[PDB]
Design a protein around this ligand. Structure first.
Ligand SMILES: NC(=O)c1c(N)c(C(=O)c2ccc(F)cc2)n2ccccc12
Ligand SMILES: [Fe+3]
Ligand code: NA
Ligand code: NA
Length: 312
């Protein structure tokens, strides 16, 4: 019937997928919102915007498209820009009126990030929910497609994965070039559309030597990020990990991928130079890794050429 219904999903988190954001424990097992019995953190799995709601008098909400780290991802029409679809994501699990307002300022700089292979941020907006409480939303480009997220039985051939990350590295270079790192590179964060690849999640983007270390997904984070903070080197590491996760059979512990490589992997015995590149990328010592994304790109170009050649 209506073409937009298809892009969207049923706005309930099934009980299976319901966990606390602060402790990982399966809350809502069946209150949809409330406080976690085990850590006292507030949670809600209910959509905070509903179809028909109009945010900042500009964004007409049509419903939800996914649910993730911070809650629901909403799809809205932008009534300024010819009713083109955009995405609304929240900013913090909770805060007062001041905290939300602060949260937006901490993230306001993302405006300036402009590259063909990164989601465009359009706007940052307040919505007064049913309770007079103001909630901050980031407005961003709706990129239709699927993530490169591949589970055990659907791992990408090496040629294809390399091709993808060669499209991504430029975007990292760009970020690096303007004093920024994309701390959260992983298959789940790269979207393959009918045209191109895009990076979608800018919640981890930071400045080089930005305060703290709470940047990005474990199993992909470089080991030294606690002491170094986010650096080009920690980004390079995520790339090696991302390539690993796309192509190799990685063991897990407690849902997280294990550090290092399954050192006797079929794929890795096969593509001698790819394996060497992977190893260089994720080297425990930041200094042993590729010094630049451009550098890694150049060497990874070589490896593609070698991989295609060996494929016959
Ligand atoms: N800016 C987007 O377009 C966007 C997006 N598409 C997603 C998804 O997680 C997703 C994946 C497949 C789908 F079919 C629908 C949604 N996302 C998640 C976080 C931030 C932005 C976005
Ligand atoms: Fe909890
Ligand atoms: Na994330
Ligand atoms: Na990083």
């Amino acid at each position: 019937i209506d073409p937009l219904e298809a892009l969207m999903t049923n706005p309930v988190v099934p009980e299976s997928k319901r966990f606390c954001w602060n402790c990982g424990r399966p809350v809502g097992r069946g209150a949809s919102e409330g406080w976690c019995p085990y850590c006292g953190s507030p949670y809600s799995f209910l959509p905070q915007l509903n179809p028909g709601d109009i945010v900042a008098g500009q964004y007409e909400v049509k419903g939800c498209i996914a649910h993730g780290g911070l809650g629901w991802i909403y799809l809205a029409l932008d009534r300024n820009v010819n009713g083109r679809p955009v995405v609304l994501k929240g900013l913090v699990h909770s805060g007062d009126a001041e905290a939300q307002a602060m949260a937006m300022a901490e993230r306001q700089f993302l405006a300036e990030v402009v590259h063909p292979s990164i989601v465009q941020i359009f706007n940052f907006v307040e919505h007064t929910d049913r309770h007079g409480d103001p909630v901050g939303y980031i407005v961003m480009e709706y990129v239709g497609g699927q993530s490169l997220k591949r589970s055990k039985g659907q791992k990408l051939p090496v040629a294809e994965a390399i091709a993808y990350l060669l499209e991504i590295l430029p975007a990292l270079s760009y970020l690096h070039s303007i004093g920024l790192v994309y701390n959260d590179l992983k298959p789940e964060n790269i979207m393959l559309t009918e045209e191109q690849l895009k990076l979608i999640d800018l919640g981890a983007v930071s400045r080089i030597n930005s305060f703290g270390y709470l940047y990005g997904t474990p199993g992909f984070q470089a080991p030294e990020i606690v002491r170094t903070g986010p650096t080009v080197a920690t980004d390079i590491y995520t790339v090696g990990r991302t390539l690993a996760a796309l192509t190799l059979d990685l063991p897990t512990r407690n849902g997280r991928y294990v550090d290092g490589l399954p050192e006797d992997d079929p794929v890795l015995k096969t593509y001698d130079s790819y394996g060497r590149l992977l190893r260089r990328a994720i080297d425990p010592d930041p200094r042993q890794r590729f010094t630049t994304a451009e550098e890694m790109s150049a060497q990874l170009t070589g490896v593609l050429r070698e991989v295609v050649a060996q494929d016959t």
